[PDB]
Design a binder for this molecule. Structure first.
Ligand SMILES: *[C@@H]1O[C@H](CO[C@@H]2O[C@@H](C)[C@@H](O)[C@@H](O)[C@@H]2O)[C@@H](O[C@@H]2O[C@H](CO)[C@@H](O[C@@H]3O[C@H](CO[C@H]4O[C@H](CO)[C@@H](O)[C@H](O)[C@@H]4O)[C@@H](O)[C@H](O[C@H]4O[C@H](CO)[C@@H](O)[C@H](O)[C@@H]4O)[C@@H]3O)[C@H](O)[C@H]2NC(C)=O)[C@H](O)[C@H]1NC(C)=O
Ligand SMILES: *[C@@H]1O[C@H](CO[C@@H]2O[C@@H](C)[C@@H](O)[C@@H](O)[C@@H]2O)[C@@H](O[C@@H]2O[C@H](CO)[C@@H](O[C@@H]3O[C@H](CO[C@H]4O[C@H](CO)[C@@H](O)[C@H](O)[C@@H]4O)[C@@H](O)[C@H](O[C@H]4O[C@H](CO)[C@@H](O)[C@H](O)[C@@H]4O)[C@@H]3O)[C@H](O)[C@H]2NC(C)=O)[C@H](O)[C@H]1NC(C)=O
Ligand code: HEM
Ligand code: HEM
Ligand SMILES: *[C@@H]1O[C@H](CO)[C@@H](O)[C@H](O)[C@H]1NC(C)=O
Ligand SMILES: *[C@@H]1O[C@H](CO)[C@@H](O)[C@H](O)[C@H]1NC(C)=O
Ligand SMILES: *[C@@H]1O[C@H](CO)[C@@H](O)[C@H](O)[C@H]1NC(C)=O
Ligand SMILES: *[C@@H]1O[C@H](CO)[C@@H](O)[C@H](O)[C@H]1NC(C)=O
Ligand SMILES: [C-]#N
Ligand SMILES: [C-]#N
Ligand SMILES: [C-]#N
Ligand SMILES: [C-]#N
Ligand SMILES: [Ca+2]
Ligand SMILES: [Ca+2]
Lengths: 104, 466, 104, 466
């Protein structure tokens, strides 16, 4: 990291002098809590048939969505205090913050 | 293998299983496509699997400039010393720049309208084409950069391309930070959480970890509950832009052809300004446009965004609801009665318990969006904690934070304090009537609207090099 | 992890049921602070000639030892309120807590 | 590159260079051998390099039983149903058990005396032979397990080998926990830090991460400052045991032959009890037996333990002194005057500044052991914070902590509260006069000694299944 600089790097590298990769691209996320996997280190809950999570069966993500998230579209409530731009800025901002890559 | 074309659960896939009697996917043996997120340490038997963030965590407008060098260089116009960002060489929006086209292998945008033949756009972030409203925001900022570089060039004739690009980029990064922290975050968290998590900025702290927390990638998806089932387009007098003023969202995903062949970014931006966002309510969480028909035009079947958010949290090994409540210092409900008290909805509490069995297993996104919204905020206590905690780290742990001593001069800081999204829109579009501040609250024409001419332009005098 | 057990596993696995590997053998240490390497992610300070740390030259570990740690043995002060067992239990306990492997 | 025979800096070697005018190594082309700790994710350009802990972090006596299944199995006597740990089949200590020998490719113990041909011992941890005083502690605990398994077999006739092994292993683990937190830790931290970092145990908290922090592996090395330059051996009447009662430490490292052929563990244990530890003073930090002659007999050159500690912290990418002070909520001195104040020693502050340039760069071990010791404690504020924080996590985050409800019965806990290191020594050796509790404080014979007959033994009655 240069002794001094006037602009941010493209990667985020060197923003933090003592730990120059912090906030930089293509680095692992920081964890605020320890990970919780089926095998303790890699497999996600719902991977192995019959493997419960803390005493209870893993709820199918599609099931939770069907039973709790789904609602009649004609019931939609327009937010009298938020524009759709409020939604749009959130996504645009999200795209400034994180992108979790996957294999193609 | 292809996680998009088969339901075999083998690396790198983790397809979503279908419940008996699903109202849409009748064949229970099938699935919803899902690729596991890339591991930070491939094939390890020592490390606890973690995921990767391909972008800079800082609020630096990297979605415009890029987070990798080759890309950042490719997004720039290197044909001169004007410090500009490359623009589309085939199409223009009523005389205004459009983002250039990307060169993808299995371009999804081409699939949204096979005859139009319009590929996906090239931006600092790979998702610029996901929905036309997003594309319009990406295009808006690209134009603002070029506008800034142009003005800076007149101000400072001796500045070369690199200087002009860097100085314009610097201003854009600051505009995103100001709009985000001054106008956006307060409306997300509410005044109480804003004060608690984002107290007055004092100084850059090199001991504050600025990295995006894994949980945030999922928690910040609270925004999916804000999505309306249509893309609204309005004409110059904010009236429906015929013949299609209300396009179903399931037909705008990756629809870059609409920006190019259906009137540019102006009708889209007006739509965003004068249309209300969807309100998140405990019995109206997310729409079927994203729950049943997500990416319908580019996938074998429609995806389910809420379900994908929950499968993703598991893929990422994220702890359950109570663990996050505990982390946040919030009470952990153990029974349906306690959960009913926390959510101020026993009915929803019961539903969650029938599905998960224990509040300890509720997925972060689900439990997070289930919580009653804070006053003048759009998230409950848990999401307010996670989101608020993250943005303070992104502010305090950023050496290039706009208010940090040495980044901008006092007079430049004073000039920057006058910026606003409504003005930015005025400067880079054919739109002459925009929302009154706060733009994220204003949503009714003509009541919440004013003439662009009443809004002063950003004063760049203090950027003149003496 | 077994729904119910009676004793500690040998590896330490399953002590924490929500995150099975926590405290278990052959796993990476937890970091209470972000790592500080010469390049930001791997090389130790002192690896590359001329590369300073936080604006200052890296002092040779042997030099610090010679200048600050080294002392004439006759000056040794026997601790009047601690037995040599105090030292020994410390090393024994250390050996219950951690061992950082290296290549042979 | 062979890190043991070469001074070339190439992976995985990071040899310590030799400064000009070195008091011992006049040839600057030489070096002190150093192998970088194994990375958790080898060859990654994504992960920030981290190191590995090959042991169980919990205070569970894994140095006795092993942290891996194959080893744990091999340390056990599988020739019967007595639940015993395997003992040496070739040698005995006045009719008592010795640890079995290990089978190492390049046995260092053999090099400490070519003609004795005594290899290193096999234990739960690979370092049991590093110094004869440590081997004596490992041997003492092995005997106690077998003694416990024997008494348990008498009380519960139906218990098989496995049950007996597990029950004795469970008792020993509790013994290590009791002696450590009740007797040891208070004398390390002092009263104030003890109350601050280790408040009264409540119960098992599954949200408390029990892993060893990377920094602790270096910080707990404060114990190197307590090391005396000799191994003291005393006879049954606590008098210097001839003809070699004070062996230079540089001739006891990996000297397993001394345990086998020089009188067993009794003379060693008596020496540990009746000899004062070395006090850590700011200008009497660590002895030359470890600073100049570490492992002199088992390798090409004598190592420097304090220097290795500093090289290791760099290898592990550990932050400097000030970063750790900050982490601990302690003031961070920036000038030599401020550092002089923190250390209550201007002369030491100056030596540090001369070496490091800034307190930000002081290596954790060096800074830690430099701080003045807390009242009735043997570490300063920084180390007290790091060490105290670690041990509370190992306590509160251990499902099998001896006080956790369900682990032991109320009467079993009442019994265990009567255990002590002196008693264990009385139960497993030919020593009849031992230190009064606290064994870690008592160090003067006969003033601080009592007969074994006055110390009631552990009553296993409440272990009766009946
Ligand atoms: C079981 O143990 C849990 C862990 O406890 C820790 O370790 C044990 C051994 C003890 O030493 C204990 O004292 C330790 O805290 C424990 O859960 C913990 O509970 C605390 C208190 O509620 C949580 O702290 C809160 O954290 C949130 C989130 O931010 C934190 O994490 C980020 C990211 O790393 C950091 O940058 C922050 O600095 C925080 O550390 C904060 O928002 C919150 O602060 C805000 O609220 C308080 C109260 O109004 C204000 O005073 C502040 O100014 C802020 O406005 C707290 O700091 C801690 O995160 C949590 N850890 C875990 C893993 O859950 C649990 O309570 C114990 N249970 C029992 C029954 O003992
Ligand atoms: C610069 O920012 C630094 C980071 O600050 C955090 O993030 C920013 C964005 C804010 O939200 C801020 O509020 C956050 O704290 C900041 O340094 C931090 O300072 C705090 C306060 O001194 C430190 O907390 C202390 O930590 C030690 C060590 O234990 C901690 O870590 C372990 C391991 O993860 C956890 O298990 C513990 O729960 C702790 O989190 C504690 O021993 C200490 O608590 C003890 O002492 C206090 C005070 O007497 C008692 O109340 C407690 O009961 C305990 O007895 C504190 O919890 C924090 O470690 C430190 N972080 C870092 C990375 O250094 C710094 O102060 C900021 N500087 C300025 C000028 O703003
Ligand atoms: C036009 C609106 C939006 C979408 C279309 C959309 C879509 C997604 C998809 C497909 C994902 C990935 C799902 C999976 O895990 O498989 C997703 C992730 C993220 N979003 Fe989305 N999103 C739209 C809109 C929003 C808004 C308004 C948000 C924020 C206020 C928001 C957030 C997020 C976040 C943070 C992610 C993860 C990003 C990452 O890869 O790290 N979304 N969304
Ligand atoms: C007979 C007394 C002791 C030693 C001989 C001795 C030696 C070492 C060595 C060689 C290392 C490794 C150095 C390196 O980094 O290359 C070392 C590491 C650790 N020690 Fe040592 N030690 C003796 C005595 C003690 C005492 C009394 C300690 C604490 C109260 C103590 C602690 C430690 C720790 C925690 C380590 C790191 C272990 C790991 O690999 O994780 N030591 N010691
Ligand atoms: C670069 O800028 C020039 C002048 O504005 C413009 O004519 C040209 O088309 C631009 N090139 C690209 C790729 O945008
Ligand atoms: C596809 O794009 C063409 C323009 O090339 C347009 O005329 C047509 O209506 C579009 N298709 C659909 C289904 O709207
Ligand atoms: C196992 O125990 C029996 C009985 O104590 C003993 O004779 C034998 O030597 C032991 N074997 C080993 C390998 O320790
Ligand atoms: C080495 O061990 C032998 C026993 O075979 C012993 O007699 C001799 O004294 C030892 N050597 C030294 C230098 O102590
Ligand atoms: C996200 N989109
Ligand atoms: C394409 N331009
Ligand atoms: C330490 N050995
Ligand atoms: C080995 N005996
Ligand atoms: Ca960014
Ligand atoms: Ca252990």
């Amino acid at each position: 990291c240069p002794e001094q600089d006037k602009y941010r790097t493209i990667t985020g590298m060197c923003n933090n002098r003592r730990s120059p990769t912090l906030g930089a691209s293509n680095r692992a996320f920081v964890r605020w809590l320890p990970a919780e996997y089926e095998d303790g280190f890699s497999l996600p809950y719902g991977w192995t048939p019959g493997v419960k999570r803390n005493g209870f069966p893993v709820a199918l993500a599609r099931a939770v969505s069907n039973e709790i998230v789904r609602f009649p579209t004609d019931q939609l409530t327009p937010d009298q205090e938020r524009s759709l731009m409020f939604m749009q800025w959130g996504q645009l901002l999200d795209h400034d913050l994180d992108f979790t890559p996957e294999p193609a | 293998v292809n996680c998009e074309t088969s339901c075999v659960q083998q690396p790198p896939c983790f397809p979503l299983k279908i419940p008996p009697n699903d109202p849409r996917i009748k064949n229970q043996a099938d699935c919803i496509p899902f690729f596991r997120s890339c591991p930070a340490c491939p094939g390890s038997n020592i490390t606890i699997r973690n995921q990767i963030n391909a972008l800079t965590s800082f609020v630096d407008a990297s979605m415009v400039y890029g987070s990798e060098e080759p890309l950042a260089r490719n997004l720039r116009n290197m044909s001169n010393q004007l410090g500009l960002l490359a623009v589309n060489q085939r199409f223009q929006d009523n005389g205004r720049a459009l983002l250039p086209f990307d060169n993808l292998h299995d371009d999804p945008c081409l699939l949204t309208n096979r005859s139009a033949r319009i590929p996906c756009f090239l931006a600092g972030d790979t998702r610029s084409s996901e929905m036309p409203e997003l594309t319009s925001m990406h295009t808006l900022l690209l134009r603002e950069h070029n506008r800034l570089a142009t003005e800076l060039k007149s101000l400072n004739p001796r500045w070369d391309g690199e200087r002009l690009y860097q100085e314009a980029r610097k201003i854009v990064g600051a505009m995103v930070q100001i709009i985000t922290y001054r106008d956006y975050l307060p409306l997300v968290l509410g005044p109480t959480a804003m004060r608690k998590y984002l107290p007055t900025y004092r100084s850059y702290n090199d001991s504050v970890d600025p990295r995006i927390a894994n949980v945030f990638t999922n928690a910040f998806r609270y925004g999916h509950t804000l999505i309306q089932p249509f893309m609204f387009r309005l004409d110059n007098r904010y009236q429906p832009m015929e013949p299609n003023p209300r396009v179903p969202l399931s037909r705008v995903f990756f629809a870059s052809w609409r920006v190019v062949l259906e009137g540019g970014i102006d009708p889209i931006l007006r739509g965003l300004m004068a249309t209300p966002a969807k309100l998140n309510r405990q019995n109206q969480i997310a729409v079927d446009e994203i729950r049943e028909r997500l990416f319908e035009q580019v996938m074998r079947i429609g995806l389910d965004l809420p379900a994908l958010n929950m499968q993703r949290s598991r893929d990422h090994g994220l702890p359950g609801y109570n663990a996050w409540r505990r982390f946040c210092g919030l009470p952990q409900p153990e029974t349906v009665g306690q959960l009913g008290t926390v959510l101020r909805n026993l009915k929803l509490a019961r539903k969650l318990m029938e599905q998960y069995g224990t509040p300890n297993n509720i997925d972060i996104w689900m439990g997070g969006v289930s919580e009653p919204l804070k006053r003048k905020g759009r998230v409950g206590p848990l999401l307010a904690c996670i989101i608020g905690t993250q943005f303070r780290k992104l502010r305090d742990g950023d050496r290039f934070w706009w208010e940090n001593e040495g980044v901008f001069s006092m007079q430049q800081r004073q000039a920057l304090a006058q910026i606003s999204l409504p003005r930015i829109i005025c400067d880079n579009t054919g739109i002459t009537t925009v929302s009154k501040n706060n733009i994220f609250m204003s949503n009714s024409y003509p009541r919440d609207f004013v003439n662009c001419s009443t809004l002063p332009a950003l004063n760049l005098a203090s950027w003149r090099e003496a």
